[PDB]
Amino acid sequence: KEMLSEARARLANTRGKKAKRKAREKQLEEARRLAQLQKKR
RNA sequence: UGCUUCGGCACAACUGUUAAAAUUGGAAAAAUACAGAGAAGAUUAGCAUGGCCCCUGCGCAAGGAUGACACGCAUAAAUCGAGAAAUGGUU
Numbered sequence A: 001k002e003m004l005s006e007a008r009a010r011l012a013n014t015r016g017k018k019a020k021r022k023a024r025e026k027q028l029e030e031a032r033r034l035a036q037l038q039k040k041r
Numbered sequence B: 001u002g003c004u005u006c007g008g009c010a011c012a013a014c015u016g017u018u019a020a021a022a023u024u025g026g027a028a029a030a031a032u033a034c035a036g037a038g039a040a041g042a043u044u045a046g047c048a049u050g051g052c053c054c055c056u057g058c059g060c061a062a063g064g065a066u067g068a069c070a071c072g073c074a075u076a077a078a079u080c081g082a083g084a085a086a087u088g089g090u091u
C-alpha cells in the first residue's frame, strides 16, 4: 500500500513548490498594504 | 622701466567650474527579520537561448547557483453551427 500510494502521487505530480509560496507571498504583501492603508487612515 | 624735442611716448592687457560653503538630494553597506535554489522520483555536471538584469575580470577569455530571471500557473472559451422540430402566426 505504501508503494501504491508513492506510485499514485509520483504518477500525478508535475508541479514545483514555489508556486505555493507565490499566492501566500502575494497575500502577505496585500495584508501589509492593507495595514499601511489603515495606518495612513 | 627704457626713450626721451623732458610734453609725454613706448611697453605690458581681463584670473577664477569663481566656496574657507550652503543646501541639496541619492546611494551601497550593516544588523534585524523575512524567507532561502534548474531539469524529470532523488542526487547531481554543465553549455546555451532572450534582455531597460547585472557583478568579478584587461577581456571578442573565464566566472558569478547551469549568475540571476523567464520557464506558463496554459482558471491563454484555442469556440459554434446544424437541423429538426416544432412551434408560432396567419389564413
Ligand SMILES: [Mg+2]
Binding pocket: B047, B048, B066
Ligand atoms: Mg550556460
Ligand SMILES: [Mg+2]
Binding pocket: B063
Ligand atoms: Mg557564465
Ligand SMILES: [Mg+2]
Binding pocket: none
Ligand atoms: Mg555546482
Ligand SMILES: [Mg+2]
Binding pocket: none
Ligand atoms: Mg545563464
